[PDB]
Protein backbone atom coordinates (compact mmCIF):
# COMPACT_ATOMS: atom_id res chain seq x y z
CA UNK A 1 0.00 0.00 0.00
CA UNK A 2 3.07 2.21 0.43
CA UNK A 3 3.92 1.89 -3.27
CA UNK A 4 0.42 3.07 -4.14
CA UNK A 5 0.85 6.01 -1.76
CA UNK A 6 4.13 6.94 -3.44
CA UNK A 7 2.60 6.61 -6.91
CA UNK A 8 -0.33 8.81 -5.91
CA UNK A 9 2.09 11.36 -4.46
CA UNK A 10 3.92 11.29 -7.79
CA UNK A 11 0.86 12.56 -9.66
CA UNK A 12 -1.04 27.37 -16.47
CA UNK A 13 1.20 27.83 -13.44
CA UNK A 14 2.14 30.45 -10.84
CA UNK A 15 5.00 30.48 -8.34
CA UNK A 16 5.47 32.22 -5.01
CA UNK A 17 8.54 33.88 -3.50
CA UNK A 18 9.19 32.17 -0.18
CA UNK A 19 12.11 34.39 0.86
CA UNK A 20 14.06 37.01 -1.08
CA UNK A 21 17.06 39.22 -0.40
CA UNK A 22 20.64 40.08 -1.40
CA UNK A 23 19.91 39.13 -5.01
CA UNK A 24 18.71 35.60 -4.18
CA UNK A 25 15.25 34.11 -3.76
CA UNK A 26 13.45 30.86 -2.92
CA UNK A 27 10.26 29.57 -4.56
CA UNK A 28 8.00 26.67 -3.57
CA UNK A 29 6.22 24.12 -5.71
CA UNK A 30 6.08 24.22 -9.51
CA UNK A 31 7.82 20.87 -10.17
CA UNK A 32 7.77 21.47 -13.95
CA UNK A 33 10.81 23.77 -13.70
CA UNK B 1 11.60 -0.82 -9.66
CA UNK B 2 13.43 2.51 -9.56
CA UNK B 3 14.24 5.49 -7.37
CA UNK B 4 13.74 9.25 -7.66
CA UNK B 5 15.83 12.42 -7.46
CA UNK B 6 15.61 14.72 -4.43
CA UNK B 7 18.23 17.45 -4.93
CA UNK B 8 20.48 18.56 -7.78
CA UNK B 9 23.57 20.70 -7.23
CA UNK B 10 26.56 20.57 -9.55
CA UNK B 11 27.52 17.13 -10.85
CA UNK B 12 26.63 15.25 -7.66
CA UNK B 13 23.13 13.78 -7.50
CA UNK B 14 21.38 12.06 -4.59
CA UNK B 15 18.68 9.50 -5.36
CA UNK B 16 16.16 7.49 -3.36
CA UNK B 17 15.08 3.84 -3.51
CA UNK B 18 12.32 1.80 -1.84
CA UNK B 19 13.00 -0.87 0.76
CA UNK B 20 15.24 -3.69 -0.41
CA UNK B 21 16.29 -1.85 -3.56
CA UNK B 22 19.58 -0.07 -2.76
CA UNK B 23 22.51 -1.40 -4.83
CA UNK B 24 26.17 -1.75 -3.90
CA UNK B 25 29.08 0.61 -4.52
CA UNK B 26 30.62 1.14 -7.97
CA UNK B 27 27.45 0.52 -9.96
CA UNK B 28 26.07 2.00 -13.17
CA UNK B 29 22.80 3.94 -13.14
CA UNK B 30 20.93 5.34 -16.14
CA UNK B 31 18.65 8.37 -16.30
CA UNK B 32 16.60 9.83 -19.14
CA UNK B 33 16.67 13.57 -19.93
CA UNK B 34 14.29 15.21 -22.39
CA UNK B 35 14.05 18.68 -23.91
CA UNK B 36 13.38 20.30 -27.26
CA UNK B 37 17.07 20.96 -27.91
CA UNK B 38 18.89 19.07 -25.12
CA UNK B 39 18.07 15.36 -24.92
CA UNK B 40 20.68 12.82 -23.81
CA UNK B 41 21.18 9.85 -21.46
CA UNK B 42 22.81 10.47 -18.09
CA UNK B 43 25.17 7.78 -16.79
CA UNK B 44 25.91 7.84 -13.06
CA UNK B 45 28.26 5.96 -10.75
CA UNK B 46 27.25 5.40 -7.13
CA UNK B 47 29.54 7.27 -4.75
CA UNK B 48 28.35 6.64 -1.18
CA UNK B 49 25.38 5.78 1.02
CA UNK B 50 23.61 8.50 3.00
CA UNK B 51 21.19 6.15 4.76
CA UNK B 52 17.40 6.40 4.78
CA UNK B 53 17.39 4.71 1.36
CA UNK B 54 19.36 7.65 -0.07
CA UNK B 55 22.55 7.20 -2.09
CA UNK B 56 24.72 10.03 -3.40
CA UNK B 57 26.55 9.60 -6.70
CA UNK B 58 28.38 11.39 -9.50
CA UNK B 59 27.51 11.82 -13.17
CA UNK B 60 29.89 11.96 -16.13
CA UNK B 61 27.79 14.36 -18.23
CA UNK B 62 26.73 17.98 -17.71
CA UNK B 63 23.62 18.15 -15.54
CA UNK B 64 22.02 21.07 -17.38
CA UNK B 65 18.44 20.49 -18.48
CA UNK B 66 17.34 18.31 -15.56
CA UNK B 67 13.98 18.14 -13.77
CA UNK B 68 13.02 16.66 -10.41
CA UNK B 69 10.87 13.57 -10.01
CA UNK B 70 12.39 11.63 -12.92
CA UNK B 71 12.82 7.93 -12.18
CA UNK B 72 16.29 6.42 -12.58
CA UNK B 73 16.87 2.88 -13.84
CA UNK B 74 19.65 0.57 -12.69
CA UNK B 75 21.69 -1.99 -14.62
CA UNK B 76 22.97 -3.64 -11.44
CA UNK B 77 26.51 -3.51 -12.82
CA UNK B 78 29.70 -1.48 -12.73
CA UNK B 79 31.31 0.31 -15.67
CA UNK B 80 32.49 -1.91 -18.53
CA UNK B 81 34.19 -1.44 -21.88
CA UNK B 82 34.50 -3.88 -24.81
CA UNK B 83 37.91 -5.36 -25.59
CA UNK B 84 39.36 -7.23 -28.52
CA UNK B 85 41.83 -7.28 -31.37
CA UNK B 86 39.75 -4.81 -33.40
CA UNK B 87 40.35 -2.11 -30.78
CA UNK B 88 43.70 -1.37 -32.40
CA UNK B 89 43.59 1.44 -34.95
CA UNK B 90 40.53 3.06 -33.38
CA UNK B 91 39.62 5.95 -31.08
CA UNK B 92 37.38 5.51 -28.03
CA UNK B 93 36.00 7.78 -25.34
CA UNK B 94 35.70 7.24 -21.58
CA UNK B 95 32.61 5.10 -22.13
CA UNK B 96 34.55 3.25 -24.82
CA UNK B 97 32.44 4.42 -27.76
CA UNK B 98 34.42 4.34 -30.99
CA UNK B 99 34.91 7.94 -32.07
CA UNK B 100 35.78 6.81 -35.61
CA UNK B 101 32.53 4.87 -36.17
CA UNK B 102 29.37 5.33 -34.06
CA UNK B 103 28.40 1.67 -34.46
CA UNK B 104 31.85 0.21 -33.84
CA UNK B 105 32.80 -1.74 -30.74
CA UNK B 106 29.33 -2.87 -29.62
CA UNK B 107 29.71 -6.65 -30.01
CA UNK B 108 32.95 -7.68 -28.28
CA UNK C 1 -17.12 11.40 23.17
CA UNK C 2 -15.48 8.22 24.47
CA UNK C 3 -15.61 6.51 21.07
CA UNK C 4 -14.20 9.60 19.32
CA UNK C 5 -11.39 9.81 21.88
CA UNK C 6 -10.61 6.12 21.36
CA UNK C 7 -10.52 6.65 17.59
CA UNK C 8 -8.18 9.62 17.99
CA UNK C 9 -5.93 7.58 20.28
CA UNK C 10 -5.80 4.80 17.70
CA UNK C 11 -4.99 7.21 14.86
CA UNK C 12 -2.31 8.89 16.97
CA UNK C 13 -0.75 5.52 17.83
CA UNK C 14 -0.68 4.43 14.19
CA UNK C 15 0.66 7.79 12.97
CA UNK C 16 3.41 7.68 15.61
CA UNK C 17 4.14 4.06 14.66
CA UNK C 18 5.48 5.03 11.22
CA UNK C 19 7.89 7.86 10.48
CA UNK C 20 7.57 8.01 6.68
CA UNK C 21 3.93 9.12 6.81
CA UNK C 22 4.72 11.78 9.42
CA UNK C 23 7.67 13.03 7.37
CA UNK C 24 5.66 13.27 4.15
CA UNK C 25 2.46 14.78 5.57
CA UNK C 26 4.44 17.72 7.00
CA UNK C 27 5.57 19.04 3.61
CA UNK C 28 4.64 22.75 3.50
CA UNK C 29 2.10 22.92 0.68
CA UNK C 30 -0.64 25.33 -0.31
CA UNK C 31 -2.55 22.47 -1.94
CA UNK C 32 -4.06 19.59 0.03
CA UNK C 33 -6.08 17.59 -2.53
CA UNK C 34 -3.48 14.79 -2.80
CA UNK C 35 -3.30 14.77 1.01
CA UNK C 36 -7.06 14.35 1.40
CA UNK C 37 -7.05 11.73 -1.36
CA UNK C 38 -4.36 9.80 0.53
CA UNK C 39 -6.35 10.13 3.76
CA UNK C 40 -9.44 8.75 2.03
CA UNK C 41 -7.43 5.93 0.44
CA UNK C 42 -5.71 4.95 3.71
CA UNK C 43 -8.10 3.56 6.35
CA UNK C 44 -10.69 6.33 6.22
CA UNK C 45 -13.63 4.01 7.02
CA UNK C 46 -12.32 3.07 10.48
CA UNK C 47 -13.07 6.52 11.92
CA UNK C 48 -16.18 8.56 12.65
CA UNK C 49 -17.34 11.26 10.26
CA UNK C 50 -16.75 14.15 12.67
CA UNK C 51 -13.31 12.85 13.65
CA UNK C 52 -12.45 12.30 9.98
CA UNK C 53 -13.47 15.86 9.12
CA UNK C 54 -11.43 17.25 12.03
CA UNK C 55 -8.44 15.20 10.85
CA UNK C 56 -8.91 16.47 7.29
CA UNK C 57 -9.06 20.06 8.53
CA UNK C 58 -5.87 19.49 10.52
CA UNK C 59 -4.10 18.00 7.50
CA UNK C 60 -5.25 20.86 5.26
CA UNK C 61 -3.98 23.48 7.72
CA UNK C 62 -0.29 24.31 7.37
CA UNK C 63 1.94 23.46 10.33
CA UNK C 64 5.41 24.77 11.12
CA UNK C 65 6.69 21.41 12.42
CA UNK C 66 5.54 17.81 12.07
CA UNK C 67 5.86 17.20 15.81
CA UNK C 68 3.52 20.16 16.26
CA UNK C 69 0.90 18.38 14.15
CA UNK C 70 1.48 15.14 16.06
CA UNK C 71 1.07 16.82 19.45
CA UNK C 72 -1.97 18.72 18.18
CA UNK C 73 -3.93 15.45 17.97
CA UNK C 74 -2.98 14.52 21.54
CA UNK C 75 -3.89 17.98 22.83
CA UNK C 76 -7.23 17.88 21.00
CA UNK C 77 -7.99 14.46 22.50
CA UNK C 78 -7.11 15.70 25.98
CA UNK C 79 -9.28 18.82 25.73
CA UNK C 80 -12.18 16.87 24.22
CA UNK C 81 -12.03 14.29 27.00
CA UNK C 82 -11.82 17.04 29.64
CA UNK C 83 -14.87 18.77 28.17
CA UNK C 84 -16.72 15.44 28.09
CA UNK C 85 -15.88 14.95 31.77
CA UNK C 86 -17.10 18.49 32.50
CA UNK C 87 -20.34 17.95 30.57
CA UNK C 88 -18.04 18.33 39.05
CA UNK C 89 -15.17 20.20 37.42
CA UNK C 90 -13.69 21.40 40.71
CA UNK C 91 -13.78 17.98 42.39
CA UNK C 92 -12.30 16.26 39.33
CA UNK C 93 -9.55 18.87 39.00
CA UNK C 94 -8.68 18.68 42.70
CA UNK C 95 -8.59 14.87 42.54
CA UNK C 96 -6.33 14.96 39.49
CA UNK C 97 -3.97 17.54 40.97
CA UNK C 98 -3.69 15.73 44.30
CA UNK C 99 -3.11 12.46 42.43
CA UNK C 100 -0.32 14.12 40.47
CA UNK C 101 1.19 15.51 43.66
CA UNK C 102 1.04 12.16 45.46
CA UNK C 103 2.62 10.32 42.53
CA UNK C 104 5.30 13.02 42.20
CA UNK C 105 6.06 12.69 45.92
CA UNK C 106 7.41 9.17 45.48
CA UNK C 107 10.87 9.40 43.84
CA UNK C 108 11.15 5.65 43.32
CA UNK C 109 7.96 5.73 41.23
CA UNK C 110 9.38 8.70 39.32
CA UNK C 111 12.53 6.68 38.61
CA UNK C 112 10.44 3.73 37.41
CA UNK C 113 8.39 6.11 35.24
CA UNK C 114 11.15 6.03 32.61
CA UNK C 115 9.64 4.13 29.67
CA UNK C 116 11.83 3.75 26.58
CA UNK C 117 11.45 0.75 24.25
CA UNK C 118 9.38 -0.70 27.12
CA UNK C 119 6.25 -2.79 26.43
CA UNK C 120 3.44 -0.59 25.16
CA UNK C 121 0.74 -1.85 27.54
CA UNK C 122 2.70 -3.72 30.22
CA UNK C 123 4.01 -0.48 31.70
CA UNK C 124 0.48 0.95 31.62
CA UNK C 125 -0.82 -2.11 33.47
CA UNK C 126 1.93 -1.81 36.07
CA UNK C 127 1.21 1.89 36.60
CA UNK C 128 -2.57 1.47 36.91
CA UNK C 129 -2.09 -1.50 39.24
CA UNK C 130 0.22 0.62 41.40
CA UNK C 131 -2.60 3.14 41.84
CA UNK C 132 -10.91 7.08 41.75
CA UNK C 133 -12.62 9.33 39.23
CA UNK C 134 -13.32 7.46 35.99
CA UNK C 135 -12.42 10.49 33.87
CA UNK C 136 -9.26 11.14 35.89
CA UNK C 137 -8.11 7.52 35.56
CA UNK C 138 -8.89 7.50 31.83
CA UNK C 139 -6.94 10.72 31.30
CA UNK C 140 -4.01 9.33 33.31
CA UNK C 141 -3.96 6.16 31.20
CA UNK C 142 -4.14 8.26 28.03
CA UNK C 143 -1.17 10.32 29.20
CA UNK C 144 0.75 7.15 30.07
CA UNK C 145 0.16 5.64 26.64
CA UNK C 146 1.10 8.74 24.65
CA UNK C 147 4.38 9.65 26.36
CA UNK C 148 7.78 9.20 24.70
CA UNK C 149 10.99 9.92 26.60
CA UNK C 150 9.50 12.74 28.67
CA UNK C 151 9.16 13.79 32.30
CA UNK C 152 5.89 12.37 33.60
CA UNK C 153 5.86 14.89 36.45
CA UNK C 154 6.05 17.66 33.86
CA UNK C 155 3.30 15.90 31.90
CA UNK C 156 0.89 15.76 34.84
CA UNK C 157 1.78 19.34 35.84
CA UNK C 158 1.00 20.53 32.31
CA UNK C 159 -2.23 18.54 32.22
CA UNK C 160 -3.40 19.95 35.57
CA UNK C 161 -2.47 23.48 34.50
CA UNK C 162 -4.42 23.00 31.26
CA UNK C 163 -7.42 21.66 33.18
CA UNK C 164 -7.46 24.58 35.61
CA UNK C 165 -6.94 26.93 32.64
CA UNK C 166 -10.05 25.48 31.00
CA UNK C 167 -11.97 27.35 33.70
CA UNK C 168 -11.39 31.05 34.31
CA UNK C 169 -9.53 30.48 37.57
CA UNK C 170 -5.74 30.80 37.80
CA UNK C 171 -3.56 28.48 39.88
CA UNK C 172 -1.37 29.84 42.67
CA UNK C 173 0.98 27.97 45.01
CA UNK C 174 0.57 28.95 48.66
CA UNK C 175 3.16 28.00 51.28
CA UNK C 176 2.36 28.41 54.98
CA UNK C 177 3.44 26.89 58.27
CA UNK C 178 -0.03 25.49 59.04
CA UNK C 179 -3.45 25.26 57.43
CA UNK C 180 -5.32 28.56 57.38
CA UNK C 181 -8.88 29.01 58.58
CA UNK C 182 -11.72 28.52 56.11
CA UNK C 183 -12.85 32.10 56.71
CA UNK C 184 -9.20 33.17 56.48
CA UNK C 185 -8.78 31.24 53.22
CA UNK C 186 -11.95 32.74 51.73
CA UNK C 187 -10.78 36.23 52.70
CA UNK C 188 -7.44 35.45 51.02
CA UNK C 189 -9.25 34.37 47.85
CA UNK C 190 -11.28 37.58 47.96
CA UNK C 191 -8.06 39.59 48.25
CA UNK D 1 2.92 -0.21 47.07
CA UNK D 2 5.71 1.41 45.05
CA UNK D 3 8.41 -1.15 45.87
CA UNK D 4 5.86 -3.88 45.21
CA UNK D 5 5.04 -2.37 41.81
CA UNK D 6 8.79 -2.21 41.18
CA UNK D 7 9.23 -5.89 42.04
CA UNK D 8 6.26 -6.73 39.81
CA UNK D 9 7.81 -4.75 36.96
CA UNK D 10 11.19 -6.41 37.50
CA UNK D 11 9.65 -9.81 36.79
CA UNK D 12 21.16 -13.11 21.90
CA UNK D 13 23.17 -10.08 20.78
CA UNK D 14 23.28 -8.67 17.25
CA UNK D 15 23.49 -5.32 15.46
CA UNK D 16 22.29 -3.60 12.29
CA UNK D 17 24.28 -1.56 9.78
CA UNK D 18 22.65 1.79 9.00
CA UNK D 19 25.22 3.50 6.77
CA UNK D 20 28.67 2.94 5.30
CA UNK D 21 31.16 4.46 2.89
CA UNK D 22 34.84 5.35 2.45
CA UNK D 23 35.87 2.38 4.58
CA UNK D 24 33.76 3.50 7.56
CA UNK D 25 30.34 2.18 8.55
CA UNK D 26 27.77 2.97 11.23
CA UNK D 27 26.26 0.07 13.18
CA UNK D 28 23.76 0.17 16.04
CA UNK D 29 22.09 -2.22 18.47
CA UNK D 30 24.92 -3.58 20.65
CA UNK D 31 24.08 -2.87 24.31
CA UNK D 32 27.51 -3.05 25.98
CA UNK D 33 30.84 -3.59 24.20
Curated annotation (Swiss-Prot), chains A, D:
Protein family membership: Belongs to the ATPase alpha/beta chains family.
Organism: Mycolicibacterium smegmatis (strain ATCC 700084 / mc(2)155)
Part of the full-length chain shown: 12 to 50 of 548
Cell location: Cell membrane
Complex and partners: F-type ATPases have 2 components, CF(1) - the catalytic core - and CF(0) - the membrane proton channel. CF(1) has five subunits: alpha(3), beta(3), gamma(1), delta(1), epsilon(1). CF(0) has three main subunits: a(1), b(2) and c(9-12). The alpha and beta chains form an alternating ring which encloses part of the gamma chain. CF(1) is attached to CF(0) by a central stalk formed by the gamma and epsilon chains, while a peripheral stalk is formed by the delta and b chains.
Role description: Produces ATP from ADP in the presence of a proton gradient across the membrane. The alpha chain is a regulatory subunit.
Official protein name in the record: ATP synthase subunit alpha
Gene name as annotated: atpA
From Swiss-Prot, chain B:
Localization (cell): Cell membrane
Homology family: Belongs to the ATPase alpha/beta chains family.
Subunit structure comment from the entry: F-type ATPases have 2 components, CF(1) - the catalytic core - and CF(0) - the membrane proton channel. CF(1) has five subunits: alpha(3), beta(3), gamma(1), delta(1), epsilon(1). CF(0) has three main subunits: a(1), b(2) and c(9-12). The alpha and beta chains form an alternating ring which encloses part of the gamma chain. CF(1) is attached to CF(0) by a central stalk formed by the gamma and epsilon chains, while a peripheral stalk is formed by the delta and b chains.
Function field: Produces ATP from ADP in the presence of a proton gradient across the membrane. The catalytic sites are hosted primarily by the beta subunits.
Official protein name in the record: ATP synthase subunit beta
Organism for this UniProt entry: Mycolicibacterium smegmatis (strain ATCC 700084 / mc(2)155)
Covered residues, full protein: 8 to 115 of 475
UniProtKB/Swiss-Prot annotation, chain C:
Region (ATP synthase subunit delta): 1-191
Record localization: Cell membrane
Domain of life (superkingdom): Bacteria
Family according to the record: In the N-terminal section; belongs to the ATPase B chain family.
Quaternary organization: F-type ATPases have 2 components, F(1) - the catalytic core - and F(0) - the membrane proton channel. F(1) has five subunits: alpha(3), beta(3), gamma(1), delta(1), epsilon(1). F(0) has three main subunits: a(1), b(2) and c(10-14). The alpha and beta chains form an alternating ring which encloses part of the gamma chain. F(1) is attached to F(0) by a central stalk formed by the gamma and epsilon chains, while a peripheral stalk is formed by the delta and b chains.
Comment field (misc): Binds 2-aminothiazole antibiotics, which are antitubercular agents.
Role: F(1)F(0) ATP synthase produces ATP from ADP in the presence of a proton or sodium gradient. F-type ATPases consist of two structural domains, F(1) containing the extramembraneous catalytic core and F(0) containing the membrane proton channel, linked together by a central stalk and a peripheral stalk. During catalysis, ATP synthesis in the catalytic domain of F(1) is coupled via a rotary mechanism of the central stalk subunits to proton translocation.
This protein's name: ATP synthase subunit b-delta
Phylogenetic placement of the source organism: Bacteria, Bacillati, Actinomycetota, Actinomycetes, Mycobacteriales
Residue range from the parent sequence: 199 to 396 of 445
Amino acid sequence: XXXXXXXXXXXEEIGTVIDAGDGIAHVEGLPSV
Amino acid sequence: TAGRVVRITGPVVDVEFPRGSVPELFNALHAEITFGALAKTLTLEVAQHLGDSLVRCISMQPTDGLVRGVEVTDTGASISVPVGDGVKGHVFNALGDCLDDPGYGKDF
Amino acid sequence: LTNLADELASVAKLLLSETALNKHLAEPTDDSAPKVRLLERLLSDKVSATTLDLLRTAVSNRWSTESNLIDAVEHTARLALLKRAEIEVDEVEEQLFRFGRVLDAEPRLSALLSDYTTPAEGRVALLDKALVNQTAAALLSQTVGLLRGERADEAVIDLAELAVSRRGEVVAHVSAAAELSDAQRTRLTEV
